[PDB]
């Protein structure tokens with residue numbers, strides 16, 4: 001009566017003892033690759049009909065940070081796919097209102113989305129998969145689900161996922177992550193894989209008649225084609241966990257007729273503003289472009305570094321939440337300023353380099369900080385505590401650079417380590 | 430009995446990468462295991478600073494710079510590294526009377542030029558730099574402890590000598606662990622000075638045994654022991670130093686702590702030869718680092734060393750013969766970065782098609798496969814020649830892909846970042 005989860009075997013895998021909050025187990029579990037040190041990762045992308053806002057930035061920056069930790073810090077090999085939903089009810093509606101083609105609208109806002117991601121120093125994925133370029137593959141994917149008897153065709157030419165038939169199989173469970181969230185249909189919970197199109201909507205040919213992909217089928221199709229029958233990581237905001245992500249699991253399990261398409265499903269918490277999710281529907285949003293006319297990429301990234309990725313966060317506007325971010329950014333700027341100059345202007349001809357007790361004490365705190373930050377990253381990507389550890393180290397380095405005769409090589413190594421962590425955070429100084 | 434034993438560190442609680450390194454203590458490739466956690470305490474012998482450094486010195490310090498970058502940047506070990514400067518030496522004393530400037534001023538001039546040459550070659554400074562002239566008091570205390578443990582004796586002239594026979598007698602000590610077969614005021618001719626009674630007109634320091642100078646080897650045991658302690662994860666130097674210098678360091682340090690294993694992994698770089706002979710100040714066959722740098726770049730010089738396994742000897746053919754290949758490789762890397770940055774800059778998201786094609790998948794497969802080949806090369810005793818070849822082959826295929834295929838912008842960026850990562854590990858700058 002309750003979904004089971006199979007932890008990957010550790011034999012032959014890279015083992016870091018990283019633990020992650022897995023929505024499939026609703027618990028922190030040890031992260032174990034399916035193969036070697038490889039991570040196949042699919043993340044749901046935006047629906048490109050309007051500008052992106054600070055809530056979208058929170059999800060994509062948080063998972064950018066996680067990806068940098070996985071790759072730059074732990075040395076996993078990440079193969080990442082992000083889709084672009086450039087066919088959608090919202091795009092169609094917006095495009096008639098503005099009297100422009102569906103493709104021209106979608107391409108503009110896809111362009112602005114990637115520009116906003118680049119402005120926030122978010123890395124592009126390995127592959128970008130647009131629905132409009134995968135419609136043929138989606139049709140073939142649906143044909144296989146029908147052939148496995150997990151979907152049916154209505155008279156109008158739609159295709160619906162057959163929840164009851166899927167559940168019946170002992171190898172399949174429907175709504176693995178939110179079990180409790182559950183006329184032409186067998187049962188009302190059945191969802192469309194293929195929607196019969198009105199003659200005035202954009203549409204594509206199919207064995208069942210002119211139509212469009214359903215809301216969820218594109219993500220199973222694209223991830224399955226490129227990454228295959230087992231994903232190490234699948235990610236998105238928490239609102240997508242059900243119906244969207246649970247439905248992806250059902251579609252993909254039905255396609256491959258197996259029991260676990262995704263090993264680790266990661267859900268970022270929502271950014272709220274004045275207690276409510278930042279949302280285009282609520283008209284309480286701040287565009288990323290507007291945010292960047294007031295704050296820098298570094299300051300915005302610090303905002304997200306200070307909030308655990310899988311917890312919700314409150315954003316207080318009019319600069320309230322950003323006060324701390326600006327202070328931290330300023331302290332990092334001034335630290336780098338001093339250490340860079342002290343290194344550049346250091347004179348080996350006239351210095352004394354005896355390794356003193358003050359040098360030893362700073363070095364001990366330095367190596368200790370490396371170990372604290374390691375534990376924070378293993379603890380479900382705990383960037384708030386890792387950032388605080390960096391701040392504490394910087395406080396002591398600043399004292400050391402002011403009074404003690406300075407060990408040039410120790411400061412260079414410290415600068416390189418803090419640079420390494422800031423690269424992992426996505427900060428640029 | 431009659432053969433030195435070696436104790437591999439326990440793996441429990443340690444970072445385990447399956448890295449194997451050529452250990453001179455075992456004369457074999459053995460798995461590298463830290464003494465503690467992911468930490469590596471590393472001492473490397475430094476230059477004697479009386480004249481300019483040459484290309485042979487560059488090979489040793491660049492090779493161990495590459496190894497350090499692999500350990501830290503690639504494997505994420507935590508390296509605490511110490512390098513000494515021998516600024517008191519018979520050669521410095523003699524050279525300073527010739528040059529008629531104080532011995533301190535001469536030594537500091539050539540130490541400064543050594544570090545400038547290292548920076549020009551993108552060699553990272555160590556955590557600590559230990560000059561003999563700043564450690565004489567500690568050296569005296571170190572010798573006092575060795576005498577107190579009865580492993581050294583004082584001659585009437587005021588010199589102190591290490592007592593090889595007394596040291597060997599102990600069942601926990603073996604003399605010449607790494608080159609066992611290389612073995613009037615002294616008990617036995619193999620005894621070596623820890624403290625030298627001072628000659629007239631030489632610089633000198635006070636001690637309980639009279640005015641003198643450190644012996645040839647005692648500074649490295651003293652400095653490493655003071656900063657790093659009673660067990661070093663790595664000790665390094667050129668192969669010529671393995672005996673007597675490094676074996677004598679082991680004996681001094683074991684005598685000070687009265688234990689059996691001061692160094693877990695002893696790594697020796699091979700010599701750079703020129704026309705069949707070690708590049709050497711004595712043979713007057715040397716090329717200074719500065720003269721090399723007026724003809725070639727840091728990248729080209731580092732590629733020269735990347736092409737030769739760090740612990741094997743290499744031949745250097747002068748007049749540009751060995752550098753022809755290095756210049757070609759450096760040019761192909763410069764050109765690769767030019768091309769890929771142009772393709773990225775000129776990529777247009779509004780007119781492109783981003784379907785993940787068969788050509789995209791084949792390049793990605795080669796990309797991930799290259800990551801695993803390079804991983805195995807680094808685990809195989811820092812095999813940079815084969816790692817560099819793997820990067821060259823990947824670049825050849827990326828160049829083909831950028832010329833004809835519609836390009837996956839994100840895939841090209843990710844590949845560029847990985848090659849950047851490996852090039853940072855090599856010390857190359859593009």
Ligand SMILES: Nc1ncnc2c1ncn2[C@@H]1O[C@H](COP(=O)(O)OP(=O)(O)O)[C@@H](O)[C@H]1O
Nearest residue numbers: 011012013014015036037075446447800801804
């Ligand atoms: N940095 C890395 N690059 C490429 N592959 C890696 C890396 N780290 C680990 N692996 C791969 O992970 C697998 C197991 O990791 P490892 O820590 O070596 O455990 P094992 O003791 O099983 O070899 C191996 O197939 C290895 O190639």
Ligand SMILES: Nc1ncnc2c1ncn2[C@@H]1O[C@H](COP(=O)(O)OP(=O)(O)O)[C@@H](O)[C@H]1O
Nearest residue numbers: 045046047055056058059236237270271277278
């Ligand atoms: N306020 C918010 N806070 C955090 N993440 C959000 C917020 N709003 C949307 N997201 C996330 O941003 C991503 C893109 O959302 P959106 O552009 O609305 O398209 P869709 O959610 O339909 O894929 C999704 O993972 C979504 O969960």
Ligand SMILES: Nc1ncnc2c1ncn2[C@@H]1O[C@H](COP(=O)(O)OP(=O)(O)O)[C@@H](O)[C@H]1O
Nearest residue numbers: 015016017370371374442443444445466467505
């Ligand atoms: N990148 C790193 N930074 C700091 N410490 C590390 C790092 N990698 C490993 N360690 C430390 O090295 C030791 C080896 O841990 P590991 O073998 O990964 O897991 P386990 O603790 O099960 O042995 C641990 O004490 C760990 O704290």
Ligand SMILES: Nc1ncnc2c1ncn2[C@@H]1O[C@H](COP(=O)(O)OP(=O)(O)O)[C@@H](O)[C@H]1O
Nearest residue numbers: 475476477485486488489666667699700701708
């Ligand atoms: N031709 C050479 N090739 C490689 N390494 C060399 C060469 N000549 C000297 N070295 C190494 O350079 C380092 C510095 O040597 P040197 O300046 O002579 O002082 P010392 O021998 O006291 O270290 C040593 O590790 C030595 O083995």
Ligand code: NA
Nearest residue numbers: 167169170172
């Ligand atoms: Na079932």
Ligand code: NA
Nearest residue numbers: 239240242243
């Ligand atoms: Na939901």
Ligand code: NA
Nearest residue numbers: 597599600602
């Ligand atoms: Na003995």
Ligand code: NA
Nearest residue numbers: 669670672673
């Ligand atoms: Na020798």
Ligand SMILES: [Zn+2]
Nearest residue numbers: 044045219244
């Ligand atoms: Zn999706």
Ligand SMILES: [Zn+2]
Nearest residue numbers: 474475649674
């Ligand atoms: Zn030495």
